[PDB]
Each structure stands twice: as C-alpha cells, then as structure tokens.
Amino acid sequence: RILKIYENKGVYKVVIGEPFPPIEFPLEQKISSNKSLSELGLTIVQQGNKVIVEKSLDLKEHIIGLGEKAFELDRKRKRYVMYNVDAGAYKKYQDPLYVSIPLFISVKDGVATGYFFNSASKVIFDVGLEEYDKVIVTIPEDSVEFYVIEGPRIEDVLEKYTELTGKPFLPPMWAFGYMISRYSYYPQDKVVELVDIMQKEGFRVAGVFLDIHYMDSYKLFTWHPYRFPEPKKLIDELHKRNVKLITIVDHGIRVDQNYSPFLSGMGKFCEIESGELFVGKMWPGTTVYPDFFREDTREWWAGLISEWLSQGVDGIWLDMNEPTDFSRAIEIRDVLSSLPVQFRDD
Amino acid sequence: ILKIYENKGVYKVVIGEPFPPIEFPLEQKISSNKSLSELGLTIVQQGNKVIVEKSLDLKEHIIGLGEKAFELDRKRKRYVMYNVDAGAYKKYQDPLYVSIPLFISVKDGVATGYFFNSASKVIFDVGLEEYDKVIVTIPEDSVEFYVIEGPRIEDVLEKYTELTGKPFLPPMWAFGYMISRYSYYPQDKVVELVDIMQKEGFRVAGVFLDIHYMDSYKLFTWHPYRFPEPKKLIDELHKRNVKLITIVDHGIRVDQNYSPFLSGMGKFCEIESGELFVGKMWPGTTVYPDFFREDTREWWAGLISEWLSQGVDGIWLDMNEPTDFSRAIEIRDVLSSLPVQFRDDRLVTTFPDNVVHYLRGKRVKHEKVRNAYPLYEAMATFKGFRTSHRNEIFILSRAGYAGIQRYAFIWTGDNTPSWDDLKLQLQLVLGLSISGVPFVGCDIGGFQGRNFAEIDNSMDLLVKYYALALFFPFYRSHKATDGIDTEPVFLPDYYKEKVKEIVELRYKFLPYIYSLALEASEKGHPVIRPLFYEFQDDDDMYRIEDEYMVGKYLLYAPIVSKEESRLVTLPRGKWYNYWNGEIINGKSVVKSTHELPIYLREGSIIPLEGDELIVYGETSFKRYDNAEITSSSNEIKFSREIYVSKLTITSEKPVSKIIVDDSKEIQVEKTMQNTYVAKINQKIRGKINLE
Amino acid sequence: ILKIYENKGVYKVVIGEPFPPIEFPLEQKISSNKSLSELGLTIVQQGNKVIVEKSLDLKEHIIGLGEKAFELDRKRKRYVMYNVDAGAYKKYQDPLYVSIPLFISVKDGVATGYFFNSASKVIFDVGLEEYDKVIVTIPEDSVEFYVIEGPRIEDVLEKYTELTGKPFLPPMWAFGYMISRYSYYPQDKVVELVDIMQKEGFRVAGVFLDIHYMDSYKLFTWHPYRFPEPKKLIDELHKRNVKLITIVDHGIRVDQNYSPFLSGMGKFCEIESGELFVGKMWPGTTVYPDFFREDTREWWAGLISEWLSQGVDGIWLDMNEPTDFSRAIEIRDVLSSLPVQFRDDRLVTTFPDNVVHYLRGKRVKHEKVRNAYPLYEAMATFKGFRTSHRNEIFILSRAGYAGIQRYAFIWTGDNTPSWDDLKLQLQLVLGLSISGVPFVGCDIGGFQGRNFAEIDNSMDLLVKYYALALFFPFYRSHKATDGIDTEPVFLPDYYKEKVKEIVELRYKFLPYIYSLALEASEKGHPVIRPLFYEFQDDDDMYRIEDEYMVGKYLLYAPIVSKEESRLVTLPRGKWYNYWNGEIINGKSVVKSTHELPIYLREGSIIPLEGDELIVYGETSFKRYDNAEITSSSNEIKFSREIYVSKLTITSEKPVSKIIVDDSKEIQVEKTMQNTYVAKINQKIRGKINLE
C-alpha cells in the first residue's frame, strides 16, 4: 500500500500505489505535502485491482462537471460511467457518451474544489446514488493518481486544471464562423453550386465539411474517382469564394494489399493479447487501427495528415475515434440474422 | 344450483357452492323470489368457469373496476382483474396493482352495482366481445356476487361499503404533507432534510423510510451503519413533530439466523407438492407468509406491534400484490448471454401457478385467491396496531381487493412524471375512489427517476403535480433512487414559493378534507369524486376527467397543461368562484381565473383552518369533530357550541349584519362580489341570523 | 514462501500459507534438507494459482488419479479433479464422481508418489500440454503437497495410507453377494424376492433399498403405503440372516413440517450473500447440510444413529458429489418450448459458484473445497455408527476425496451395460484401488435400464459381469427402474446355474478376500491390484488391463469377450492353473482353459471356505482371524492352533504323505498334475511336514 501526497500552487497530487497514467501531466514545482487524506476529507481503499475514493456529500452541496453527460448540470443522484462509446441515436439520460473527462467540481458553502482522476479506464462516479451522503469514485486499476484542485471560485479550479492538463489552442477566427455540412455533399460540382447559392442569397459561409462520401471506398486520404476527380479544382474554387474546406478523417485503415497507408503503417497498428494485429470492421470494411499511444505511430500519422493538408485542405474532422469498431455488432448480425427477433442495442 | 337472497336493496346471487376469498356478513339472509331475468342477468356454468351476462345500451354508463389506466366510463374494453407489479406503467396498461371486482351501471339515470366476490382472475368484458353486452367471466366453477340497488351512485357505494366494510378513520396528520424517497439515509440526513424543510416554511406531517433503512433488506431490522441509533432518529423526528412511516415488504429472507424466518416457520406459503414456496425478492432468496391463515396473521400482528413499539408511526406495505421475482431472474440467468431484447411480461412477476394457501382451513390454489392476499396482509397489519393499543392508525398499501378500505390508504404506485401522467393519475385515483377506496393519492412529482428517456423532470410540471393533488386524501412526494432531488427546498425561489403556497392552501382546507374523511368512515362516501358522482343524470359528466369534486361542495379543475388558464365545465346549478366571487350558472363552459380553478356550489359549508367558515346556500354538514352545521334562508344553526373565527358568506342578496344567538350583533363587510365577511371570533351557543 | 519438511520418506512441501480441505497429521516432521530441485520439481505462483512441474521421460509411467475412465498409465491427457454427477458416463469422459489428487511415478522401476492436498479443481496435465512434462495446476494461491518415497508402489501406498488414514475394517458380510434395485418395493415384495433367491440357492448377504422407500424422497422417513411396517420388514430380513442397507441422500427438503429441516436449521450451506443455499434434488426444493462444520457433523451423526437404531445395517450415501439440479431444471423451464437439443454439461449439476462453507471456523468458497464434501459426510456418517455402538460398519459412497477410505466403500456409479463396459469397470475399480481406496466394485449387470438404445441387456453379458467382479471387494447387482429384472432367479436355468456357480465360487474364496481386507485395513495395501503393482519393473505390465491380481497370490484374467477362451499374459515367475493343475513359466502368453481364468503364483497360501487351505511354494500369510501361516521347504507352520478341513498342496515334486505335529500321519492323494490333496479334518497345534 502506497500513498503519497504532493502540493503545488493550490493543487494536491494524490498518488495511490504505483500509477501508470494514460498521459503524464507536468507538475513542475511539486513538493511533498503535509496535508493528510483526512484533512482533504477523503477516504481511500485499495481492493481487487480497484481503487475506491470517497468524499462526503452534503444536502446543499453541488457536484458539477464530468464533461459530456445527458443529465442535469448538478450531477447528484446518479452513477456515471466514464467510457468513450458510439452512443448512436442517443436520448436524454443515456450514459456513457462519446467523451470522458474524469473531473468533477464540488461547490460547498459557495467554495469550489476540483477532483480530477487521471485514469482513462472505466472510471465510475457514484454521486450520492449508492450512498445518499457520499460521492464514491471507483477506478478499475490497482493504482491511480488524482488531483484535488483548490478554488475558491469555479474559475480558479478551471484555471489550475487547465494549467495542469493544457491550455486550449487558439484557433483562427473563421473556425467560429457559420459552417455547412452534410453526410454527405457530393459530387464536387454540387459542393460549389451549394456554396454559390448560399452566398448569393446572403449567407456568409466560413467553411464546408466533406463527409465520408468523398473518399474512394471509405479509404482514408483518397478521393472518390468519380465524385471528386478534380480535388485541386474543388479546393481552388472554394478558396476563390473565401470558403474553408474541412475533410472528415476516420481512424480505420482498410486491410487492403494495395492501399498505401496500410503498407506504410505496418508495424504501428494495434494488436491483441496473443500477438496478431487487431483486425476489426469499420466504414472501409475489414480494418486495422493505428496505435496512437506510440510516438512513432503518431509521427507516421502526422506525416499523412501533413501531406493531406498540403493540397489546401483547411481542417480535419476526426470522427468515430472513441475508438469505435463494428466487428462484434456485425458478428451478432451474421449469426442471428435469420431469427425474427429484436436485438437489444448494447 | 342457484340461490338468491335479498336484504336492504342487496341481492346476493349464489352459483353452485362458492368458497369466497373472504366472507362478508349479511344482516339477514332472506330468500328472494327475484329471478335472473328480472335482474336482467344470464348465467352459464362451464369448464370450471361461470359467465354472467348483462345487456349494455348505447347510453348506458359503466364505471368502477377500481385502479384502471383507462377512461372512467369503462365501455369497449376487456379488463383483467389480477394484482400485478405493473412496473413503469403507461396508460391503457392492464392489469395494475389493485383488483376491485365491482362495477356500477347507470342506465336512465339509475345506478345499480355489481360486485363479484372472487379474488381470482376475473374478466370484465365491457361491450368488447359483444357490443351490446357486459360479459363477466369468473375462472371458478362456483361464485357469489351481489346486485346492489341504487338509485343514486352514492346509494350503491353506501350499501357496498356496508357489505365489505367501512373505511377506518385515520388520524388528521395522515392527510398532511408527506415527504419520501427511495431512499432517505443515513439517519442524520433524514433529520437534516426535515430541518431544512421546516426552516423554509414547509409543514411536514411525516417522512417515509424506504428499503435502504433495513439491514440487507431484512424486514424489521435497522441497517447497522446507516441507522446505528434508530431510537435517536425516532426521538429527533418526534421532537420536531414529524411522524415516521417505515416501508415493510412481504418477503421473509431464507436466512438461518434471521429471527422472523425462524419464528414464522410453519406459517409460510407452500407449493402443491408440499415444500415451502421459495422465491426471490429484495432480501434475495425468500419465503412468504400465508396471510390467508389466522395464525400467520396473528404472528405478523405481533411482529408489527413489536416494530411499532419503538415509536414508528405508520406502516407502508409494498410489493404485496403479491410480487415475486424468481421467474424473471430465472429467464435472465439462462438468456443472460444472448444479445436479444426480452418482452416485459408483467404477469411473470406474480406468484407461480403451483403456490397454495390455507383459507379457512381449506387448501387452495394461489390463482383462485391471489387478489385478496394484500387484503389479509393489511388486516394482519391493522391488527398489529390494535395489539399496540395504537389509536392513530396509518397503513399504506400498493395492492388491494374489495374491503381493503377497512385497513389502508392506497397510492398509485410507480408512476412516470410527464404531463400526460397528470391526467392518468386523476383517472387512477378517481377509479379507486368510485370503487370504495376513499383514501388515495399518487406520488407527487412522479416516482421514476432517470432510468429511461421518457421522463419529464421539469420544475413547472413538478408544481402542477403539487397542484393536481391539492385535494387528494394522500399527499406524498416520492422519488426513485436515481431521480433528481424533488424536495421543494432544492427548487429555485420562483418554484419553491409556488409549492409552498399550494401546501399552505392544502392545510387551510385540511379541516374540510378531514371532515369528508369522517364522512367516508361513517357512510362510505368517497372524499374526491368524479363529477358524475354528484350529477349522474347528466351524460356529459361521464366524459369530464380533468375535473373532480371534493366532497359534495367543492369542484376543482386543476390545470393539467402548460397554459395559464383552461376551460372549465360546470355541472347544472350555480357555482361560486372561490377566488373572485363571481357566481356562474351551471351547465356551461368557462375560462378559469386563477392558477387553482376552485368553485363552490350553491349549498355548501366549508370548514377552514383556524376555525374559519364559508357558507353558501342551504345545506347540512358534519365537521370532523362531530359538530353539525345547517344553513337555511337566513340562519345558521349549530348542533353544539363551537368557536368560530372568521365567517364568509357568499350571497347574491346583500348582507348587512349577523346576530349571534339573538344577542350580539356583528357588522359584516363586503370584500368582493357576492362575498360578505364577518369577524366573529367567539363561541356560538346555537345560531346566527343574517340580515 | 516455501517450506519443506520430511519424515519417514515423506516430504511435505508447503507453498505460501495453505488452508487444507482437511489436515493430515505429520508426526516427527523436521525441517527438510532436500531442495525443490533435488526433488526435481519447479513451482510457480501466479494469479491465485500454483503450478507444479515435473519432467516426464518416454518410459516413465504415471498411475493413480483415482476414478478415471482411461487407461491405467495416465500419460497424454489433461485430467480435471472435480466431483461431478457423470450421468450415463462413457469411456474417456472426465471428470467423474471421485477425486483423489494422487499420482505415482514409476521411473527406472522406482516408484514415487505425489499427493496434492487441495479439494479444488486441480488439473493434472500429464504430458499433454508439454510432451516431456507433468504439469499440475492448483487453482489456489497456496497449497500443500507431498512427495512420497517408494521405492515399491506398495511402499508409496503404505506411506500415503499412513498419512491420509487406514481403511476401516468392515464386517465379512459386507463382501457378500448384495442384491439391489432402484427400487425394490413395497416391503412385502422385498421379502418375497429374498425368499425366492434363498430358496433357489443364492446366498444373499444384504439387500439395498433405494429412494422409493422414503416418503416423498424425504430422508429418514418410510413411505406410508409401501413401507407401513418398517419394523416388520427389518425383522423378517434378519430372521433370514440378510442385512438391510438403506440409501441416504444429502438433500434436506425445505418443508415446514419436516423434522430434519427444522432441527438442522443453522447448520445448512449458505451462499456468499448470506441466505441459505436453496437448490433442487429428489425431495424437490432442498437445502444441504454444511458437513465441513463440526456441529453439522454431530447433528447428522445423531440422525444416522437414530436411523440405525431401528435395525438398519448399512448406509448407502448417494448424490454426495455434492450434486444439485437447480441449474439444470432452470434451463429446462426457460428453454422448454424450443425443439432443440441441450448440450449435456455435467458440470451444471455441481453446486453453483456462490455457495460457501465454514471450514474450521473459516468461511470458504465451495469451489475451493468441493471434493472433500463427501469425505466429511462419510465422516459424520461413520460417527453415526460409533454413536450407535455399532462395531459392524458398512457405508457405501458414490463420491470421495483422499481419505475417504477411512469411512466407506465406493462403487463406480451409473454404468451402462455393454461388453466395452467390462473393460471400463476394470480400469475404474483398479484406478480407485491403486489410489488408496481398497473397497470398491461396480453394479453387476450395469445400472442403466432401457432409457436409450445403446444398452445391452443380453444374459450372457450379465453372466460375464458376475464373473468379472468375482474377486472385487464390493459385489452388488443394481439396476435402474426401467431395466429388466436382473436377479438370477428370473434367468433361464442355463444362465441361472452359471451365476449360481460363480457366486458359490466367490463365497469359497471369501476367507481369502476378507484376509486381504484385513491387510488393507492394517497396511493400506489394496485388495485387487493391477499387475504392475506386483511387477512394477516390467513395462509390459502397464498395458495389461483385462487382468488383475487378487492380493499377492492370485491372478485373474476374466473373459471380457464373447470368446470361449482368451489369451492370458503371465508376469515373471511360475504360475499354477487353478483348474487343471498345469504350472507355466512366467513372462509368456497362454490360452485360457476355463471360463474363469485363475492362476496362483509360486509362493501362495489361500484360505478357503470351510477351513479349506491351498498352499503353493514358500511364503507367509496372516488370515483374517490373526492366524499366521508360513510355508517353507517341506513344512507349514501355524502361529496358533487352528482347524483344517481339506489341504491342497501344489508341487512339481511328488508328495506322498504329511505329518501333523510330528506325530499323526495322513495319506495324500494326487488329484491332478502338481496337485496333492490331504483330508485333515482336525486341529493343528503348530505344524505340518510333507514327505
């Protein structure tokens, strides 16, 4: 059992065991803290490959955060699951969704305090559900590092939290303009025709998004030979009309013998426990996925992106990157397709 | 074999040799000469079934059948009478938790009741199978039913109540504002919430403790960590004038060291083959007490009495359909893997077919007496209060059968918050009310929390729930574990104030409500009533369901939409707009003028909080404290000396003054159209004359 | 953590901090001075698992593992040790009812034993995963096992028996001819059958009563209509000198008025969550006694003792794997409608994973101690006999674990009659025998009746079953309810006579068999033995499975084919053909000359019924009554005065006469080659000399 607490400019870094963070966050001026878990109002328990962190919850206490949740802003009375998932045609009160920000802020007596658990696993935030007077956080790992971020203002917590995890990049002003998109706009001449009508009728269009129909058989970094024969012409036309072009880019690399990205990416794809490549299903059909956790895979991908950008593409729209895979679903469909039964959408 | 008896306008028809779920006393069984044809009935005995037929005319109205998620006029539907855990029920779902095999027919303005005393899966086919017929199917080879003569709907209910039992008289606090949740804990949080509620101006009569207070859901136990000091909790709540109502299920955990399991041995339900019926419920593996047996009832009364002796004020009986989860869990274990969606068959939650009971010493199948299970459990629980020499009795039950009114209040179960639910709840509580169960209500704010998308937790809807139930006998706010906090103290000031005023208004009218409760326990008259109860001769009244009568005098048309006003249908006669004093002529449609459309009918006397009094027209009324008030042309008589604070007199003719007992003359002030007020603030020995 | 102790050729290896299913006493255990590598073992502790590895050479033999439906040399298979109701088991099916986690390695003629004292799902991968390795996986984070030095296989078993417990000494009648069925009833039919059997010349030692004698399968009850007079049935059988053995299952019916259920309360098995483990067995809904507890064992001993006091002579423990049918029945209730075939999974009949027990005060999961359940039930049952002051003990068990030999006989369960089964049964009983469980047998005639096509009920096969089991310790005929009547008295004269002679021959050899039983209870030597037990240095012996040794002197090669004679493999040394007197040189293959291929090895002494005595060569032998007989050159000594009827002497050298105690002379008669008989009919103070 290991428990170390560090402090630094209003941020307490609590270390349970020997954590292996999804990503490491720089905490420069970190110095050993004399603050105890008890003064911090926290209780910790290490069990079967799990860490449970408890905090009390008062009747008037407010709990906010947890990112993208289809629930009321004050999170009380619910057990939230932090696990990126393709939510489909999501409805309210559906959980989890596409994004997982393991951060919640407590506002007690007007004072805000943040709690950030740096684990990208299936973290559970039980906010006054299991125990009406408690916030119970379960991290499915034997070790974990989390942060108690002092306020007192909610803005103070976010400033410190942002300092810790990274400042938002500064995008260009046109990124906040009016964007038109569809799944999908094509062929290329129709894209320009629509932009013209929009502009002619008084709509200031900052950019147009191109969905998966622009690709050749949904293959990343390719142009459909019939719908987009002249990408250079398309791009010049949009730029002459001062309109940006944003292209969707998925994460699936088609398992194709003559598909360049598949051949150049070899060696940098995700694998399964037994050693083979993880082969799944996505838009392109049979697909493999780049292991973005590796520095070299990231380099290979940046190159692909850079090259794609050099044509004059202005933005990148990353989709299905939960990451999502359809092999299991298609598998169920292939075996029980005959049965006049209704599958449960899990 | 057919035998017909008659007595005080009640015909008891016996087919074959019936073995009733329960026996109802007949003052004097006198043989009758009336024939089935004179009663307009046809009877057929078939394969272990009895089919009773009655004609059904186009204008004939059929009401009753208790708790049904349908329009009050029951025509064009085949109803099933079988207690079942309805889950997150929606409208038009059948059957539900309660089964009252009683329906009333109103033909040519004349009411006649039909009560089939069978707790089996009785089928009421109301003009569905045969457009011109009401076909009742009892799945037993024998049966006893009653034809209850009217002519008024009230006459039928009086006779029916006389037959099955008068509603017990609960304490006044049972009609107060109750807060509840699934669940409130630990104990300190319970007290903290009560304090905030009281500190912010909410008069809380009692708090309900749901299953989280138990130790592993074991009945009659306190959770060792959440409720370490029950005596302290109880003292604290009482110290704050708050009653404590604890939920009590029907499942006894099959536990080697669980006292109730060991002491109850020998009194549990069995299956055909002789073993105990072992099922699944909150505690896990469980057995169930056979409440049809006297010794079991006595054993339970003792456990209840023991539980009440700590200072617990009320018992909340839940899951007593009776419900069991062994079959559902069973299906889930085998097809757990399979990526398929199951059909939610509610009947799967009932007791399996091989369960048996011992009724009056005779061994009988569960399916023949099922619906009466909650009746007997409530009976045993009531006996528990008697054993504790407890005069103030409060028992809430989810399920029921004819006669349940003798022992308990009934709430509409796990409703889903939504605008449509406002109308549904009205149909449910009125359905129960017109069927002999007076003390009813629904969960204010809706039970369902956030486990599915179709749940509306908006605050204006919550306010409308509080407003809807304004005059319901049972006024409780309850919410599922994952639901947002619905206590008024957590609402923004704007909405908090609205709830606060509504609750204060309910307490202002509490004396009237409780007086009607007394009336219910004495005559069997329901407290809240559908309009056709008071105006059964007007066919239009059978289509009005978003309005209800409170007692015989008050009409309430709750706003069940997002509008600021609504159209209000007024029955024949004159109606006094409680809020602006305007007197409108009945049998018309008007637009409401206040957020709470309240009207008093000519010929009303309403007792208000603080000994206030409102008199309009001539009528005779009995207050909850037995004081009778009779108003006439220009005189108000009192059966005994009573103190009177403010007196409000609605009158189209000007009132200049009143004289108390032919001596002290009091000045009257006209506060608004047709409204005259008089500060009396004194005891009135016997009468008041108006001038 | 690793610790190794040693004592008298036994190394106790302790990994981590083990919590044994049962603790075996180790006398003067001293810290060992032999490392793991010197023991040729490799150990690895992983995810709650301990893996022990040993090398495996091409010529190395691996025997043991108890009841396995495989060849005696266990190589090339991954065995699972988990008691399970195997159903209508076929060959190569694994696992079965009994789990003895012991295997013996014979390398270069030297035997070494390996006993892993874990009653969990131990895996013995014998050269399957790794061709040159024996990998043992214990699903626990800790474990204690023993390396038992030989060098003889007999040495290993002696030490192993010393460690886990000497076989109890049963009465001689326990080895007699037993008739049984599922089931014999009513009581008058039981006596009628016994009379016909005795009248026709069959000496019946006892009759077994199956579950039909109980009232609704309730333990310790008599069926009110089939067995109205149990006391009369008992006296009738005893008057005929026939013992009564009653089956007793492990399921306690969950019945409100069933005494054992009420008195056992508090001592039943539970599930992790705290409730009682409620399952399904013959009685229907049932609970099971937690035999791992001392108080449960005393409670059970009391019921057994009480049951024995009526005059019941033996207890037949069945379904004690332990088996439960709740899962299997659950699947049928849910997938009943589907016209598909369920995959027959025998593991579904074990206790579910959430069942827990209290072993030595510690709460443990069923899967960790499962296999020892029958051991503890047998222990409690044995205690029941002690409580009754019953010295003649007879207990039959279906399941078992190391140490089960202390308390019970074991039969091979529900076998299917067929010619192939003859060989299978031999492997099964020899597997048990070489693994420390001496008193074993199979159902003569096969258990399965006629519920499937692959059942051979031919009469000549039935005769071969009787012949096959001729020298098995347990000799019982048992049949399923729908099977044809297999009692000899229902056979045509031709076959009836054959069975009669075989049974008479068994009784003729009973004194020898019982003497070996005494040997088993004193030294832990098995009664029937595979040939490699006596000739472990000859690799050929590990492939001979249709032959077995009875004690150390008799070799029996039963005819398990349709042929009239078979080939018989004879081990090294000289062998005497019991029927024709021919003496053949060992390590050869000869053709049988009789239906019952029997041979005596040079150096044998065999006590026969009626004080007969056969002596061939030089050797020493303790008769069951303690009388020791030593034969030398031309002299036979006796440890004490004993009576001798007929004396048969086999010798290649002519014998003309014998002298009794140096005085009296008796004429000898050469009946056949190498065979000389002498009718002594008198007591012999100390010796006999031959001239």
Curated annotation (Swiss-Prot), chain A:
Transmembrane domains' residue ranges: none
Location relative to the cell: Cytoplasm
Active-site residues, record numbering mapped to chain: 319, 322
Its biological purpose: Major soluble alpha-glucosidase.
Family to which the UniProt record says this protein belongs: Belongs to the glycosyl hydrolase 31 family.
Protein name: Alpha-glucosidase
Organism listed in the record: Saccharolobus solfataricus (strain ATCC 35092 / DSM 1617 / JCM 11322 / P2) (Sulfolobus solfataricus)
